[PDB]
Scaffold this active site. Structure first.
Site, PDB file in Angstrom:
ATOM      1  N   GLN A 105       0.799  -1.207   0.000  1.00 20.55           N
ATOM      2  CA  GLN A 105       0.000   0.000   0.000  1.00 20.55           C
ATOM      3  C   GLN A 105       0.831   1.255   0.000  1.00 20.55           C
ATOM      4  O   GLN A 105       0.535   2.186  -0.673  1.00 20.55           O
ATOM      5  CB  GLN A 105      -0.972   0.031   1.171  1.00 20.55           C
ATOM      6  CG  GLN A 105      -2.208   0.875   0.939  1.00 20.55           C
ATOM      7  CD  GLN A 105      -3.076   1.041   2.150  1.00 20.55           C
ATOM      8  OE1 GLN A 105      -2.681   0.776   3.238  1.00 20.55           O
ATOM      9  NE2 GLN A 105      -4.251   1.510   1.940  1.00 20.55           N
ATOM     10  N   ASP A 108       2.358   1.591  -3.493  1.00 20.78           N
ATOM     11  CA  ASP A 108       1.276   1.965  -4.367  1.00 20.78           C
ATOM     12  C   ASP A 108       1.064   3.509  -4.246  1.00 20.78           C
ATOM     13  O   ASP A 108       0.903   4.200  -5.276  1.00 20.78           O
ATOM     14  CB  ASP A 108       0.019   1.171  -4.035  1.00 20.78           C
ATOM     15  CG  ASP A 108      -1.147   1.525  -4.922  1.00 20.78           C
ATOM     16  OD1 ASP A 108      -1.673   2.667  -4.815  1.00 20.78           O
ATOM     17  OD2 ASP A 108      -1.560   0.648  -5.741  1.00 20.78           O
ATOM     18  N   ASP A 110       3.019   5.961  -3.211  1.00 21.93           N
ATOM     19  CA  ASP A 110       4.179   6.699  -3.776  1.00 21.93           C
ATOM     20  C   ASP A 110       4.116   6.830  -5.314  1.00 21.93           C
ATOM     21  O   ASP A 110       4.578   7.821  -5.885  1.00 21.93           O
ATOM     22  CB  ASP A 110       5.463   5.964  -3.346  1.00 21.93           C
ATOM     23  CG  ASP A 110       6.761   6.768  -3.558  1.00 21.93           C
ATOM     24  OD1 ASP A 110       7.065   7.372  -4.647  1.00 21.93           O
ATOM     25  OD2 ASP A 110       7.549   6.718  -2.600  1.00 21.93           O
ATOM     26  N   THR A 184       4.089  11.595  -8.088  1.00 19.89           N
ATOM     27  CA  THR A 184       5.194  11.398  -9.028  1.00 19.89           C
ATOM     28  C   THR A 184       5.350   9.911  -9.324  1.00 19.89           C
ATOM     29  O   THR A 184       5.263   9.108  -8.387  1.00 19.89           O
ATOM     30  CB  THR A 184       6.493  11.901  -8.484  1.00 19.89           C
ATOM     31  OG1 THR A 184       6.763  11.130  -7.324  1.00 19.89           O
ATOM     32  CG2 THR A 184       6.390  13.414  -8.105  1.00 19.89           C
ATOM     33  N   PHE A 186       7.983   8.285 -10.207  1.00 17.16           N
ATOM     34  CA  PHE A 186       9.232   7.759  -9.626  1.00 17.16           C
ATOM     35  C   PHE A 186       8.976   7.206  -8.246  1.00 17.16           C
ATOM     36  O   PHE A 186       8.085   7.697  -7.575  1.00 17.16           O
ATOM     37  CB  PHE A 186      10.290   8.827  -9.620  1.00 17.16           C
ATOM     38  CG  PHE A 186      10.489   9.424 -10.956  1.00 17.16           C
ATOM     39  CD1 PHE A 186      10.066  10.718 -11.231  1.00 17.16           C
ATOM     40  CD2 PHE A 186      11.020   8.650 -11.982  1.00 17.16           C
ATOM     41  CE1 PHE A 186      10.211  11.252 -12.529  1.00 17.16           C
ATOM     42  CE2 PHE A 186      11.164   9.170 -13.269  1.00 17.16           C
ATOM     43  CZ  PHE A 186      10.784  10.484 -13.531  1.00 17.16           C
ATOM     44  N   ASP A 188       9.913   7.626  -5.115  1.00 11.25           N
ATOM     45  CA  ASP A 188      10.733   8.722  -4.618  1.00 11.25           C
ATOM     46  C   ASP A 188      10.424   9.269  -3.213  1.00 11.25           C
ATOM     47  O   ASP A 188      10.969  10.335  -2.855  1.00 11.25           O
ATOM     48  CB  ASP A 188      10.715   9.924  -5.601  1.00 11.25           C
ATOM     49  CG  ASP A 188       9.292  10.357  -5.992  1.00 11.25           C
ATOM     50  OD1 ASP A 188       8.315   9.835  -5.429  1.00 11.25           O
ATOM     51  OD2 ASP A 188       9.153  11.210  -6.899  1.00 11.25           O
ATOM     52  N   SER A 190       7.408  10.431  -2.458  1.00 11.58           N
ATOM     53  CA  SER A 190       6.478  11.516  -2.649  1.00 11.58           C
ATOM     54  C   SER A 190       5.313  11.401  -1.645  1.00 11.58           C
ATOM     55  O   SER A 190       4.705  12.357  -1.278  1.00 11.58           O
ATOM     56  CB  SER A 190       5.916  11.515  -4.085  1.00 11.58           C
ATOM     57  OG  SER A 190       5.379  10.254  -4.486  1.00 11.58           O
ATOM     58  N   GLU A 258      -6.212   6.610   5.744  1.00 10.57           N
ATOM     59  CA  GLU A 258      -7.277   5.686   5.323  1.00 10.57           C
ATOM     60  C   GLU A 258      -7.502   4.436   6.216  1.00 10.57           C
ATOM     61  O   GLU A 258      -8.630   3.971   6.374  1.00 10.57           O
ATOM     62  CB  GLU A 258      -7.103   5.286   3.850  1.00 10.57           C
ATOM     63  CG  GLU A 258      -8.210   4.392   3.331  1.00 10.57           C
ATOM     64  CD  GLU A 258      -7.899   2.869   3.381  1.00 10.57           C
ATOM     65  OE1 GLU A 258      -6.771   2.417   3.621  1.00 10.57           O
ATOM     66  OE2 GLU A 258      -8.795   2.075   3.134  1.00 10.57           O
ATOM     67  N   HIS A 351      -5.500  -5.695  -2.421  1.00 11.16           N
ATOM     68  CA  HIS A 351      -6.810  -5.831  -1.772  1.00 11.16           C
ATOM     69  C   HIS A 351      -7.236  -7.244  -1.267  1.00 11.16           C
ATOM     70  O   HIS A 351      -7.986  -7.345  -0.316  1.00 11.16           O
ATOM     71  CB  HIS A 351      -7.925  -5.199  -2.638  1.00 11.16           C
ATOM     72  CG  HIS A 351      -7.690  -3.747  -2.946  1.00 11.16           C
ATOM     73  ND1 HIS A 351      -8.406  -3.054  -3.900  1.00 11.16           N
ATOM     74  CD2 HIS A 351      -6.850  -2.849  -2.385  1.00 11.16           C
ATOM     75  CE1 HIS A 351      -7.977  -1.814  -3.950  1.00 11.16           C
ATOM     76  NE2 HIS A 351      -7.062  -1.640  -3.014  1.00 11.16           N
TER      77      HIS A 351
HETATM   78  C1  HEM Z   1      -7.298  -1.812   4.396  1.00 13.30           C
HETATM   79  C2  HEM Z   1      -6.312  -1.467   3.546  1.00 13.30           C
HETATM   80  C3  HEM Z   1      -6.709  -0.783   2.228  1.00 13.30           C
HETATM   81  C4  HEM Z   1      -7.791   0.008   2.011  1.00 13.30           C
HETATM   82  C5  HEM Z   1      -8.810   0.475   3.070  1.00 13.30           C
HETATM   83  C6  HEM Z   1      -7.823   0.407   0.620  1.00 13.30           C
HETATM   84  C7  HEM Z   1      -8.769   1.250   0.001  1.00 13.30           C
HETATM   85  C8  HEM Z   1      -8.731   1.784  -1.292  1.00 13.30           C
HETATM   86  C9  HEM Z   1      -9.633   2.756  -1.904  1.00 13.30           C
HETATM   87  C10 HEM Z   1     -10.896   3.310  -1.237  1.00 13.30           C
HETATM   88  C11 HEM Z   1      -9.217   2.986  -3.177  1.00 13.30           C
HETATM   89  C12 HEM Z   1      -9.844   3.914  -4.215  1.00 13.30           C
HETATM   90  C13 HEM Z   1     -10.721   3.011  -5.027  1.00 13.30           C
HETATM   91  C14 HEM Z   1     -11.470   3.726  -6.160  1.00 13.30           C
HETATM   92  O1  HEM Z   1     -12.282   4.699  -5.953  1.00 13.30           O
HETATM   93  O2  HEM Z   1     -11.321   3.211  -7.297  1.00 13.30           O
HETATM   94  C15 HEM Z   1      -8.026   2.218  -3.396  1.00 13.30           C
HETATM   95  C16 HEM Z   1      -7.254   2.170  -4.535  1.00 13.30           C
HETATM   96  C17 HEM Z   1      -6.050   1.555  -4.710  1.00 13.30           C
HETATM   97  N1  HEM Z   1      -5.451   0.619  -3.901  1.00 13.30           N
HETATM   98 FE1  HEM Z   1      -6.042   0.214  -1.910  1.00 13.30          FE
HETATM   99  N2  HEM Z   1      -6.743  -0.239   0.063  1.00 13.30           N
HETATM  100  C18 HEM Z   1      -6.061  -1.023   0.964  1.00 13.30           C
HETATM  101  C19 HEM Z   1      -4.919  -1.774   0.729  1.00 13.30           C
HETATM  102  C20 HEM Z   1      -4.164  -1.792  -0.423  1.00 13.30           C
HETATM  103  C21 HEM Z   1      -2.957  -2.562  -0.698  1.00 13.30           C
HETATM  104  C22 HEM Z   1      -2.308  -3.558   0.325  1.00 13.30           C
HETATM  105  C23 HEM Z   1      -2.570  -2.271  -1.967  1.00 13.30           C
HETATM  106  C24 HEM Z   1      -1.345  -2.775  -2.789  1.00 13.30           C
HETATM  107  C25 HEM Z   1      -0.504  -3.694  -2.306  1.00 13.30           C
HETATM  108  C26 HEM Z   1      -3.481  -1.309  -2.512  1.00 13.30           C
HETATM  109  C27 HEM Z   1      -3.424  -0.767  -3.795  1.00 13.30           C
HETATM  110  C28 HEM Z   1      -4.225   0.205  -4.363  1.00 13.30           C
HETATM  111  C29 HEM Z   1      -3.977   0.935  -5.587  1.00 13.30           C
HETATM  112  C30 HEM Z   1      -2.766   0.869  -6.527  1.00 13.30           C
HETATM  113  C31 HEM Z   1      -5.177   1.765  -5.846  1.00 13.30           C
HETATM  114  C32 HEM Z   1      -5.342   2.796  -6.965  1.00 13.30           C
HETATM  115  C33 HEM Z   1      -4.654   4.085  -6.457  1.00 13.30           C
HETATM  116  C34 HEM Z   1      -4.784   5.100  -7.583  1.00 13.30           C
HETATM  117  O3  HEM Z   1      -5.865   5.789  -7.670  1.00 13.30           O
HETATM  118  O4  HEM Z   1      -3.843   5.144  -8.454  1.00 13.30           O
HETATM  119  N3  HEM Z   1      -4.447  -1.070  -1.566  1.00 13.30           N
HETATM  120  N4  HEM Z   1      -7.790   1.506  -2.237  1.00 13.30           N
HETATM  121 BR   LIG Z   2      -7.031   4.930  -0.235  1.00 12.43          BR
HETATM  122 CA   LIG Z   3       6.395   8.881  -6.386  1.00 14.84          CA
END
Ligand code: HEM
Ligand SMILES: [Br-]
Ligand SMILES: [Ca+2]
Ligand SMILES: *[C@@H]1O[C@H](CO)[C@@H](O[C@@H]2O[C@H](CO)[C@@H](O)[C@H](O)[C@H]2NC(C)=O)[C@H](O)[C@H]1NC(C)=O
Ligand SMILES: *[C@@H]1O[C@H](CO)[C@@H](O)[C@H](O)[C@H]1NC(C)=O
Ligand SMILES: *[C@@H]1O[C@H](CO)[C@@H](O)[C@H](O)[C@H]1NC(C)=O
Length: 595
Positions: A105, A108, A110, A184, A186, A188, A190, A258, A351
């Site tokens: 997370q 992700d 960053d 960003t 990178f 990094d 951020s 969050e 997730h």
């Molecule tokens: C309880 C822990 C976590 C919660 C509550 C959570 C919650 C959320 C929420 C609400 C979103 C936005 C979804 C949308 O409107 O489409 C999101 C997106 C995302 N989640 Fe999580 N998440 C959790 C854990 C993780 C983990 C462990 C990872 C990766 C290993 C992860 C990776 C991502 C990524 C890459 C996105 C898209 C971010 C973006 O907008 O570029 N999440 N998550």
């Molecule tokens: Br989030």
């Molecule tokens: Ca970054």
């Protein structure tokens, strides 16, 4: 090749041809193309956007309109049929600590954020999307299927608002809709330092000339810093618990509060920055604040890179690690380091690694207090349980000694996320992250499962029987090709995640290819990669190879018992060693003999 070079939700900007540091925005990493990988630009398209009208409308928008001759299934319906499960017993990962999930997370965050459109926040717009469930313009609500318990208890939908798009925020008809990446590309730090100048400065302690990051002034953690509180009202962290009234933290990334463990990991990262800046000064007492801040910042970025690439990625990618991410040969300026749209969905594999509960543990790694284990959902936007209930040390032990959820084709996403999610406007613990993932994969115009199988040079199943062998799983395939009528229409999020994992790693083939490619590029396309000749001295690099997440924990909390390999599943006391046996970061090669 129809468009050229639009650029609206950005400012400037002009570049500094040594200035041994990163910019905050990510601009001026590439010399030739100085915007590449900068925040607040379009996500990269590795494949052309796929929308129901070829431009902007998500598949599923128009009732009549099919994808390849079939209707796309309701996102909640897929979620209920396929993604949900009841029994949490057996679901844990015998080989990955909770920290494995958590670092996922962090990384992700960053790398990518595609925020919702902010247009008309002060409009009936949310009121009309949330209250009436009326789809239109930026309202794309997740509708419930007919047998859904949520129909009886919550109403007709879960509101859902479309992700912003670049150039201007006003509706776009001339090229296809491109979602923004607000941070960003990178790797990094951020999420620690901000991706905009306007936040980067606010985060800093400019009151003293010591290059520190601002720390909380209300509250301490046994003499250890917390992050400053956000200002803004209405605060969802206050909203959970209006008796405690503790605001969210203010971090480099906006989502930092969050869930409690994310806040916890952010807190460790900020302490490490101040610790470095202290050490750097003690050792260079001529350096000014700005030097001290960049230099600590620079070290922290290298730590995040090292941890990710040396310790996290090999146990995600397993046998596919060397295929996609061969050992490093140096900076390559032809590489595109931008995060792709698809990556922001492929990384949501995390997730299915989120378990239903979180624990606080005391110094013997025993239950800390009477309610030491809590349901994950009580911890969304929950800062009070940190400030008022023990600080971060008990949560950090939990990170070390509890395990991640294991992805499982029959038990995909815990109901803590699938049924109980809280979103910071919506006032209830009632959302479904899985459904949201699928709606967003449509929102962002994703090509389907087979489009991506094709991109990565895999088979593309066209029949039930095909899909059964690819997934190994007759009944998962059956459900997936009752809902989607062809594997061509399966949303990448659920197709990628349905595939059994690769040997020694935690994602299937399709995802290992999508992830592996992205990370290779963010490393190879980065002028400030820690290991790029020039960036750090060799001696500095010799010190940095010794960093570990164990050591981070030792240097920043009052924990003295830690495992040597923090991402693996560890049990106390057998797998735990005392902090004195751990390598330290030796900072002496940062001494500036200018005297
Ligand atoms: C309880 C822990 C976590 C919660 C509550 C959570 C919650 C959320 C929420 C609400 C979103 C936005 C979804 C949308 O409107 O489409 C999101 C997106 C995302 N989640 Fe999580 N998440 C959790 C854990 C993780 C983990 C462990 C990872 C990766 C290993 C992860 C990776 C991502 C990524 C890459 C996105 C898209 C971010 C973006 O907008 O570029 N999440 N998550
Ligand atoms: Br989030
Ligand atoms: Ca970054
Ligand atoms: C909101 O936060 C308050 C204070 O942080 C929590 O109250 C504590 O919980 C137990 C009683 O249930 C006591 O040991 C503490 O003394 C309580 N303090 C106060 C001021 O009541 C309360 O549990 C939280 N409530 C919710 C609904 O989350
Ligand atoms: C800034 O640093 C000073 C002294 O170095 C410290 O006393 C003060 O609390 C810090 N301010 C913030 C807002 O972190
Ligand atoms: C850099 O990347 C490009 C395009 O990906 C590749 O073709 C080229 O061989 C690489 N160049 C070097 C010197 O590694």
């Amino acid at each position: 090749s129809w468009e050229v070079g639009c650029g609206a939700p950005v400012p400037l900007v002009k570049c500094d041809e040594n200035s041994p540091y990163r910019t905050i925005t990510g601009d001026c990493n590439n010399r030739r193309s100085p915007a590449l990988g900068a925040a607040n630009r379009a996500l990269a398209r590795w494949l052309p956007a796929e929308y129901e009208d070829g431009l902007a409308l998500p598949f599923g928008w128009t009732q009549r309109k099919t994808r390849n001759g079939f209707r796309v299934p309701l996102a909640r319906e897929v979620s209920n049929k396929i993604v949900g499960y009841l029994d949490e017993e057996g679901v844990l990962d015998q080989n990955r600590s909770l920290l494995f999930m958590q670092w996922g997370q962090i990384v992700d965050h960053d790398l990518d954020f595609a925020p919702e459109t902010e247009l008309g926040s002060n409009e009936h717009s949310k009121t009309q999307c949330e209250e009436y469930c009326i789809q239109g313009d930026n309202c794309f609500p997740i509708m419930f299927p007919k047998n859904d318990p949520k129909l009886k208890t919550q109403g007709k939908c879960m509101p859902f608002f479309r992700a912003g798009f670049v150039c201007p925020t006003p509706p776009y008809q001339s090229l296809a809709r491109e979602q923004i990446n607000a941070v960003t590309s990178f790797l990094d730090a951020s999420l620690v330092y901000g991706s905009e100048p306007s936040l980067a400065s606010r985060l800093r302690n400019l009151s003293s000339p010591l290059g520190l990051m601002a720390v909380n002034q209300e509250a301490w953690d046994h003499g250890l810093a917390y992050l400053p509180f956000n200002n803004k009202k209405p605060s969802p962290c206050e909203f959970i618990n209006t008796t405690a009234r503790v605001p969210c933290f203010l971090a480099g990334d906006f989502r930092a509060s969050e869930q409690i463990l994310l806040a916890t990991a952010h807190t460790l990262l900020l302490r490490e920055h101040n610790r470095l800046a202290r050490e750097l000064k003690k050792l260079n007492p001529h350096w000014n604040g700005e030097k001290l801040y960049q230099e600590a910042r620079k070290i922290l970025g290298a730590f995040i890179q090292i941890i990710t690439f040396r310790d996290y990625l090999p146990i995600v990618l397993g046998s596919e690690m060397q295929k996609w991410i061969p050992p490093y040969q140096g900076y390559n300026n032809s590489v595109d380091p931008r995060i792709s749209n698809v990556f922001t969905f492929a990384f949501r594999f995390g997730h299915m690694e989120v378990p239903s509960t979180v624990s606080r543990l005391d110094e013997n790694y025993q239950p800390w207090g009477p309610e030491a284990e809590l349901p994950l959902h009580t911890l969304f936007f929950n800062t009070w349980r940190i400030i008022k209930d023990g600080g971060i040390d008990p949560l950090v032990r939990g990170l070390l000694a509890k395990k991640s959820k294991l992805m499982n084709q029959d038990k995909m996403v815990t109901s803590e996320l699938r049924n109980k999610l809280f979103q910071p406007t919506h006032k209830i613990h009632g959302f479904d992250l899985a459904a949201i993932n699928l709606q967003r994969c449509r929102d962002h115009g994703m090509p389907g499962y087979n489009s991506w199988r094709g991109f990565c040079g895999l088979s593309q199943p066209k029949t039930l029987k095909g899909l059964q062998t690819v997934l190994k799983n007759k009944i998962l395939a059956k459900k997936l090709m009752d809902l989607y009528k062809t594997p061509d229409n399966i949303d990448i999020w659920i197709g990628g995640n349905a595939e059994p994992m690769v040997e020694r790693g935690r994602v299937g083939p399709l995802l290992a290819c999508l992830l592996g490619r992205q990370f290779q590029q963010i490393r190879d396309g980065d002028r400030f990669w820690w290991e790029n000749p020039g960036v750090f001295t060799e001696k500095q690099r010799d010190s940095l190879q010794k960093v570990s997440f164990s050591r981070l924990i030792c240097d920043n909390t009052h924990i003295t018992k830690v495992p040597l390999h923090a991402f693996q599943a560890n049990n106390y006391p057998h797998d735990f060693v005392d902090c004195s046996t751990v390598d330290k970061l030796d900072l002496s090669p940062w001494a500036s003999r200018e005297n």
